[PDB]
Amino acid sequence: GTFTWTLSDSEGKDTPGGYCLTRWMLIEAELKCFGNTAVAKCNEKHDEEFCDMLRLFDFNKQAIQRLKAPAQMSIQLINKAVNALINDQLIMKNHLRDIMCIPYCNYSKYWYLNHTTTGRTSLPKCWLVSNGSYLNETHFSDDIEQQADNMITEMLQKEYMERQ
Amino acid sequence: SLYKGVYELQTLELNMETLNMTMPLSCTKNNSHHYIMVGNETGLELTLTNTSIINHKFCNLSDAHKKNLYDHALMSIISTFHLSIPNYEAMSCDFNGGKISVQYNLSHSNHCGTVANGVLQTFMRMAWGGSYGCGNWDCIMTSYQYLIIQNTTWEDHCQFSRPSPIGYLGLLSQ
Amino acid sequence: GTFTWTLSDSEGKDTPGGYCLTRWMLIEAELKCFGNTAVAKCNEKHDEEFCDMLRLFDFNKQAIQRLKAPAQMSIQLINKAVNALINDQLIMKNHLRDIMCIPYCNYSKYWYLNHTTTGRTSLPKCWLVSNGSYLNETHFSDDIEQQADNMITEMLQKEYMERQ
Amino acid sequence: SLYKGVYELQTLELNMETLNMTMPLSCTKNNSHHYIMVGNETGLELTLTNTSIINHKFCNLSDAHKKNLYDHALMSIISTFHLSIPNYEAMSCDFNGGKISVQYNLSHSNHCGTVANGVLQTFMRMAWGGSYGCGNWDCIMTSYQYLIIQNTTWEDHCQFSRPSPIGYLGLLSQ
Amino acid sequence: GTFTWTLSDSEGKDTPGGYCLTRWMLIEAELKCFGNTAVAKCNEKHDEEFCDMLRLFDFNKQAIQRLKAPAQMSIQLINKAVNALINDQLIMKNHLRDIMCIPYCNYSKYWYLNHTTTGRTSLPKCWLVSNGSYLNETHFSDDIEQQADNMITEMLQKEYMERQ
Amino acid sequence: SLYKGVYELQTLELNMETLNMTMPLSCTKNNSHHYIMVGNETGLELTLTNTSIINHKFCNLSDAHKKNLYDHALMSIISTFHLSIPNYEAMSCDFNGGKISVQYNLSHSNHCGTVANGVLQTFMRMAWGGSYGCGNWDCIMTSYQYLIIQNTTWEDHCQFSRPSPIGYLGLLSQ
Ligand SMILES: *[C@@H]1O[C@H](CO)[C@@H](O[C@@H]2O[C@H](CO)[C@@H](O[C@@H]3O[C@H](CO[C@H]4O[C@H](CO)[C@@H](O)[C@H](O)[C@@H]4O)[C@@H](O)[C@H](O[C@H]4O[C@H](CO)[C@@H](O)[C@H](O)[C@@H]4O)[C@@H]3O)[C@H](O)[C@H]2NC(C)=O)[C@H](O)[C@H]1NC(C)=O
Ligand SMILES: *[C@@H]1O[C@H](CO)[C@@H](O[C@@H]2O[C@H](CO)[C@@H](O[C@@H]3O[C@H](CO[C@H]4O[C@H](CO)[C@@H](O)[C@H](O)[C@@H]4O)[C@@H](O)[C@H](O[C@H]4O[C@H](CO)[C@@H](O)[C@H](O)[C@@H]4O)[C@@H]3O)[C@H](O)[C@H]2NC(C)=O)[C@H](O)[C@H]1NC(C)=O
Ligand SMILES: *[C@@H]1O[C@H](CO)[C@@H](O[C@@H]2O[C@H](CO)[C@@H](O[C@@H]3O[C@H](CO[C@H]4O[C@H](CO)[C@@H](O)[C@H](O)[C@@H]4O)[C@@H](O)[C@H](O[C@H]4O[C@H](CO)[C@@H](O)[C@H](O)[C@@H]4O)[C@@H]3O)[C@H](O)[C@H]2NC(C)=O)[C@H](O)[C@H]1NC(C)=O
Ligand SMILES: *[C@@H]1O[C@H](CO)[C@@H](O[C@@H]2O[C@H](CO)[C@@H](O[C@@H]3O[C@H](CO)[C@@H](O)[C@H](O)[C@@H]3O)[C@H](O)[C@H]2NC(C)=O)[C@H](O)[C@H]1NC(C)=O
Ligand SMILES: *[C@@H]1O[C@H](CO)[C@@H](O[C@@H]2O[C@H](CO)[C@@H](O[C@@H]3O[C@H](CO)[C@@H](O)[C@H](O)[C@@H]3O)[C@H](O)[C@H]2NC(C)=O)[C@H](O)[C@H]1NC(C)=O
Ligand SMILES: *[C@@H]1O[C@H](CO)[C@@H](O[C@@H]2O[C@H](CO)[C@@H](O[C@@H]3O[C@H](CO)[C@@H](O)[C@H](O)[C@@H]3O)[C@H](O)[C@H]2NC(C)=O)[C@H](O)[C@H]1NC(C)=O
Ligand SMILES: *[C@@H]1O[C@H](CO)[C@@H](O[C@@H]2O[C@H](CO)[C@@H](O)[C@H](O)[C@H]2NC(C)=O)[C@H](O)[C@H]1NC(C)=O
Ligand SMILES: *[C@@H]1O[C@H](CO)[C@@H](O[C@@H]2O[C@H](CO)[C@@H](O)[C@H](O)[C@H]2NC(C)=O)[C@H](O)[C@H]1NC(C)=O
Ligand SMILES: *[C@@H]1O[C@H](CO)[C@@H](O[C@@H]2O[C@H](CO)[C@@H](O)[C@H](O)[C@H]2NC(C)=O)[C@H](O)[C@H]1NC(C)=O
Ligand SMILES: *[C@@H]1O[C@H](CO)[C@@H](O[C@@H]2O[C@H](CO)[C@@H](O)[C@H](O)[C@H]2NC(C)=O)[C@H](O)[C@H]1NC(C)=O
Ligand SMILES: *[C@@H]1O[C@H](CO)[C@@H](O[C@@H]2O[C@H](CO)[C@@H](O)[C@H](O)[C@H]2NC(C)=O)[C@H](O)[C@H]1NC(C)=O
Ligand SMILES: *[C@@H]1O[C@H](CO)[C@@H](O[C@@H]2O[C@H](CO)[C@@H](O)[C@H](O)[C@H]2NC(C)=O)[C@H](O)[C@H]1NC(C)=O
Ligand SMILES: *[C@@H]1O[C@H](CO)[C@@H](O[C@@H]2O[C@H](CO)[C@@H](O)[C@H](O)[C@H]2NC(C)=O)[C@H](O)[C@H]1NC(C)=O
Ligand SMILES: *[C@@H]1O[C@H](CO)[C@@H](O[C@@H]2O[C@H](CO)[C@@H](O)[C@H](O)[C@H]2NC(C)=O)[C@H](O)[C@H]1NC(C)=O
Ligand SMILES: *[C@@H]1O[C@H](CO)[C@@H](O[C@@H]2O[C@H](CO)[C@@H](O)[C@H](O)[C@H]2NC(C)=O)[C@H](O)[C@H]1NC(C)=O
Ligand SMILES: *[C@@H]1O[C@H](CO)[C@@H](O[C@@H]2O[C@H](CO)[C@@H](O)[C@H](O)[C@H]2NC(C)=O)[C@H](O)[C@H]1NC(C)=O
Ligand SMILES: *[C@@H]1O[C@H](CO)[C@@H](O[C@@H]2O[C@H](CO)[C@@H](O)[C@H](O)[C@H]2NC(C)=O)[C@H](O)[C@H]1NC(C)=O
Ligand SMILES: *[C@@H]1O[C@H](CO)[C@@H](O[C@@H]2O[C@H](CO)[C@@H](O)[C@H](O)[C@H]2NC(C)=O)[C@H](O)[C@H]1NC(C)=O
């Protein structure tokens, strides 16, 4: 019950921890699961494209399972629900970046770091595009490394405080 | 590729098609065709042409619901597009039978400020695709004279893009 | 002056610390005060029903004390102020949960943990309802315990860093 | 009840009645009656009936402010309710004298898409109470033919609920 | 690349770290630069007037440099972009405070602490006004000191964890 | 001044004039004059007077764009102000030639609820300045009979204030 970003309050207790995306939810991929700590970051972050997409999937799951009603789109339901589920500022910033020919997120692919042998995952970040294609890791090599360092720092700080 | 010795860079790609049951998805084929899809059965094509389908100089939109309408979802989507456009009545509409369609007259005299642009801008906003000469978007124009909105069937319409709820949702946010 | 969630900047300096709710503000209860640390969490949290209610009371107090004007409702004032004071997303999520028959907050009662002999309080969370009644602590026992552990962790981390 | 040995679970309940001086509070009595209250003196009842109060086929709403209106707060609340409803003129209004009242005709031919539902949905939204068969809320209907909005006095109207600012505020947010 | 509050993703790599405001951006002042750590706070803070102003300047810079188009105001661009760049709640709270004759931020001057010999800076906070003039540091002496203590605490906590 | 021994209190002041190329700035001179400026060339004065400029009892606003309009930016700003005001047609407009101007008739019979107040309130909101008797802002009135909006040139208009984008942006947020 460490996830507040979700609509219902059940989701966390079912999977042992973390949050899983099944095969059907992914393109050309098998089941992937992210650590509880990283997923829980969406509870407070109010600036991440991944978290909003994650929330839409959670919503969709609930709508399908909860509404016994014929599965017609309830347009009224979406029009009502979107204000609660989506951060419109992210939508507009990516729209704005596209307008100004600045690399931006088009909500496709997400890139994350995975610490070898431990399977420790960062929360995924959006893989930016410009001029009809994706940007190379070379352009944003620096950001990739910043995330690696952020993960290292958390690991060490935890060890020190656990040791205390 | 290991960063700082131990962190592998790994990728994830989302399948947004699974969201088709609750929200419309926008997917494009090329600069002339954008497609909005509902569920696994229907949708509307948005297309740019130099020909017409409607010979009317008027839009019978309110009559489309006065008559029992053909699909609340589609009428809602069409209305949303129209409501977004700032107005001016440069629109003709048919809505006769199950085949529902609307046509906009993208006419102008300098084009800056016309509703024809309001239509073009909304059209592009509805389906970003990859949006590919970095000028201002504010007063733009295209070569096509007309915009057609028409019902269609569940086939193809996904090239240079994949279905995404973002277009529709973005307009709701506006 | 550790509270930024308030409208005026005076509120904290008056009571020794923390924030108090008088008898008149509570149902069938006497004065209750919460610790400064917990109250201050509302400065950054943007997802808590309790904090928005707390803010409305603070607003109300200021409107009554500040406006010398006949106490008519200024509808225009509320219509103007609400956008700043209330997180509409919380309102809509609880509305949505009700629609989908998912337990939700109806802004009534709030449940908190109190560490014995020290009086250390968590910030209160909303007590959910469904099908005309309140949910038992059994259904959300897990969340209650998560909060207890969160409080324990903070206590220990503080002791260790204070010791350093 | 001590969690982890030392944490007592303790409860708090808010008195929202103290907010009556600055914002309207919504409180219900049953499925036929919802009450909106102002200050410590007045308010409006919202009720579902199968009888009528207004014999008009028209609403003299603008005339209600043309004439010096009877209370800006109440006119504002009434207007807000009406503005929320998507439109269609299935409303009749009196507003003659201090007793102000409005009546909606909840008429329909399949009911999905009617303004009668827009009214029913807004009505319920305005006063959640405890909202108690998990179907879609989008196209719903009730047994009552009419909705009456009328001034009233400061008595009772709180059963299965307590006064709360949430209903009103939620509509402002929309 | 530690700044996410910006529109483009380049801004951080250019200046060695931190964020600089040139002479042209300041009134009666020469170049000033703030530390990276403090600036980065705007990535998560959703309640600070300084951060929104900072963002407008960043936007302006990009619009001028990126748009090759004649520099006419694109009103449509601003009307579109503002929703993403400005926290309207701050605008409304200051508006509300002014209405109620409560000291408020009018987005003019900002006050910060600077640790001597190290040049360590807090993120600036808005200097409030009321009744046609600025408030004295005496009225908000307490807040100034709270910030000084917050900086001290961070310094010490870092030293202890670095030592671990 | 060192706090806790080591922290100097230092100040920063922002120059918002550098933002003139992308967004309008509001700057005042006194209670009778508020000025909105664009780029480094033009702007609109907002002024409170007891005289008139327009002898019309009507506003030719739509004709202002029907005719090739004189500046999209200014027409947009004027429209925005007008749209903000809740309505009532107590407005006359000229827009003839490059000199564009509008005049509002701030007429009332008790003033509470008139559009004249809607205009006064928006006017003040547009340019806070320093806003300097703590009564409610809701139903206020001034001594001036008319509001004039008129094009002007790039001179002065900054006393007791400095240019700021906040006024305009605040109205967009509303
Ligand atoms: C975010 O931004 C990125 C970057 O622009 C977009 O990425 C593009 O995604 C599209 C769709 O996945 C790629 O387009 C093409 O997809 C074809 C698959 O569909 C075909 O077959 C079905 C039937 O099964 C038909 O219905 C359909 O009409 C098509 O005929 C591929 O076959 C295409 O292959 C061609 O290009 C590749 C190069 O990538 C060559 O190797 C092939 O030989 C062939 O010539 C093609 O892949 C498009 O390529 C992607 N671009 C890039 C740079 O990767 C994202 O779509 C966008 N948004 C989201 C939400 O993801
Ligand atoms: C959030 O959701 C919860 C759960 O549904 C709601 O909780 C309900 O709250 C109401 C109001 O407090 C409870 O309703 C009844 O209140 C009566 C008190 O008012 C009476 O007297 C006044 C005069 O003083 C009259 O004006 C008024 O009309 C009433 O006649 C009690 O007397 C009722 O008692 C009956 O039920 C209890 C069981 O609880 C029996 O023991 C009694 O003998 C008697 O039969 C009753 O309490 C309602 O019971 C609460 N429900 C639950 C499950 O607790 C919240 O109101 C809602 N929102 C907010 C903001 O709180
Ligand atoms: C936030 O709130 C604060 C507090 O109210 C406002 O601060 C005021 O700012 C204004 C403008 O900076 C100060 O007003 C006066 O500015 C004059 C400068 O402009 C003159 O010269 C130009 C040509 O160069 C002309 O175009 C223009 O019309 C003016 O003639 C000064 O000359 C004035 O000086 C007078 O007052 C001072 C006292 O401060 C005396 O010492 C002088 O001798 C003289 O009598 C004056 O400074 C105003 O004083 C400031 N008030 C306070 C309390 O500091 C902010 O503007 C507001 N918003 C923002 C965004 O900053
Ligand atoms: C629209 O989205 C739905 C998902 O929301 C897509 O349908 C899903 O298709 C997969 C693969 O066929 C089904 O997976 C398997 O289904 C069986 C039977 O239910 C189950 O026993 C397996 O364990 C597994 O889950 C999935 O259930 C099904 N979901 C639903 C709700 O039907 C649908 O194909 C999408 N439509 C379009 C046009 O893309
Ligand atoms: C609407 O809300 C107001 C509160 O905002 C309620 O009035 C309050 O009632 C309490 C109890 O009677 C008063 O408490 C005591 O008042 C005396 C005299 O002021 C004071 O000396 C005591 O120390 C104590 O505060 C409280 O002051 C009063 N507040 C106000 C502003 O009048 C009112 O009853 C509510 N109305 C309804 C219909 O519920
Ligand atoms: C409206 O804002 C622009 C800034 O966005 C103001 O123009 C700026 O004026 C300064 C001082 O004259 C220029 O600084 C210097 O310019 C030269 C030549 O470009 C350069 O070599 C120096 O290193 C330095 O940057 C600045 O470039 C110029 N910026 C632009 C975009 O023109 C303008 O004065 C403001 N208008 C009003 C009415 O206040
Ligand atoms: C991070 O790397 C580990 C190690 O490969 C991944 O764990 C494996 O995931 C695959 C997924 O198909 C399983 O088949 C393996 O059994 C897992 N264990 C190992 C040690 O291989 C982990 O999934 C990666 N993280 C993510 C989110 O993909
Ligand atoms: C987008 O694709 C469509 C479909 O292939 C192209 O339109 C077709 O053009 C041929 C040749 O003129 C006609 O026979 C088909 O009937 C047309 N199909 C449709 C659906 O109109 C269209 O020209 C392409 N546009 C761009 C910009 O590439
Ligand atoms: C869109 O849907 C309509 C029906 O909802 C289709 O119209 C049918 O068209 C066929 C072929 O001409 C007729 O035999 C049917 O009688 C029509 N039905 C009705 C009630 O309109 C239309 O063809 C579809 N359009 C596309 C492009 O798929
Ligand atoms: C639609 O028709 C118009 C009018 O013929 C086309 O616009 C002209 O195209 C010729 C080339 O064939 C150019 O030399 C002219 O300069 C164009 N006119 C203008 C005002 O630019 C237009 O290209 C046609 N559109 C499509 C999609 O075929
Ligand atoms: C947590 O528990 C302590 C201990 O009971 C509470 O402190 C008491 O509160 C009551 C309230 O009526 C006072 O009468 C007592 O004098 C307080 N002291 C003790 C030791 O009993 C504290 O209030 C509780 N926390 C909350 C928020 O209720
Ligand atoms: C809600 O309560 C009201 C008030 O008790 C009920 O309406 C009353 O019904 C009696 C008997 O027909 C009449 O004599 C009263 O005049 C009615 N009062 C009012 C205010 O209309 C109403 O039926 C109840 N509704 C539900 C769903 O329980
Ligand atoms: C609502 O308020 C109005 C007055 O604002 C009340 O109307 C009065 O009703 C009594 C009884 O019939 C008359 O004697 C008065 O002359 C009326 N005054 C005016 C000016 O209308 C009305 O009764 C109230 N309604 C309720 C249900 O309380
Ligand atoms: C209002 O009047 C209508 C019409 O008489 C009532 O609706 C019918 O009620 C009978 C039972 O008396 C049912 O058998 C019918 O099937 C109902 N009609 C429909 C279309 O469902 C309605 O119940 C009355 N409403 C109230 C609140 O008394
Ligand atoms: C905090 O204080 C230090 C020490 O004065 C400032 O660093 C100096 O800034 C001035 C700015 O003109 C430079 O000329 C000096 O060379 C800098 N070094 C020293 C040691 O004087 C620092 O800028 C201050 N912080 C801020 C944000 O103003
Ligand atoms: C605000 O300043 C203006 C400009 O000085 C004042 O209006 C001037 O008044 C003189 C004397 O009547 C006239 O000759 C000028 O033509 C007026 N100028 C303008 C632009 O109207 C105005 O009275 C001042 N208002 C306040 C409240 O101080
Ligand atoms: C505002 O701008 C207009 C032009 O855009 C100015 O109008 C001109 O005024 C002069 C002096 O009377 C005439 O010679 C020009 O022919 C006018 N041009 C047009 C096309 O209107 C007007 O004076 C400006 N107003 C202010 C106060 O600066
Ligand atoms: C505009 O004209 C009106 C009408 O003459 C002025 O209002 C009156 O001013 C006299 C003083 O000259 C007061 O004794 C009256 O009480 C005022 N009337 C009202 C209804 O209050 C008004 O002051 C003039 N406005 C300006 C800016 O000069």
Numbering used by the authors:
A (entry chain c), C (entry chain a), E (entry chain b): 260 to 423
B (entry chain C), D (entry chain A), F (entry chain B): 60 to 146, 150 to 171, 178 to 200, 206 to 247
Can you provide the manuscript's text about this entry?
Therefore, we separately processed the signal originating from two flexibly linked entities, the GPC trimers and I53-50NP, resulting in 3D maps at 3.97 and 3.67 Å resolution, respectively. The reconstructed GPC model features a trimer in the prefusion state. In the cryo-EM map, we observed densities corresponding to all 11 N-linked glycans for each monomer. Overall, our unliganded cryo-EM model displayed excellent structural homology with the reported antibody-complexed structure, with a Cα RMSD value of 0.92 Å suggesting that the fusion to the I53-50A component and NP assembly did not induce major conformational changes within the GPC. Closer inspection of the two models revealed local differences in two regions: the fusion peptide and the trimer apex (bottom right). In the unliganded state (cryo-EM structure; this study), fusion peptide residues G260-T274 expand into the cavity between two protomers with the N terminus (residue G260) facing outward. The unliganded structure featured a more open conformation at the apex, particularly for residues between N114 and L128. The distances between the three N119 residues from the respective protomers are ∼31 Å in the unliganded structure and ∼24 Å in the antibody-complexed structures. Finally, the local resolution of the unliganded model is lower within the central cavity of the trimer and at the apex, suggesting a higher degree of flexibility in these regions.
Each GPC protomer consists of two non-covalently bound subunits: the membrane-anchored GP2, which contains the fusion peptide, and GP1, which possesses receptor-binding sites for both alpha-dystroglycan and lysosome-associated membrane protein-1 (LAMP-1), the two receptors involved in viral entry and lysosomal escape, respectively. The development of a recombinant protein vaccine has been hampered by the instability of soluble Lassa virus glycoprotein complex (GPC) trimers, which disassemble into monomeric subunits after expression. Here, we use two-component protein nanoparticles consisting of trimeric and pentameric subunits to stabilize GPC in a trimeric conformation.
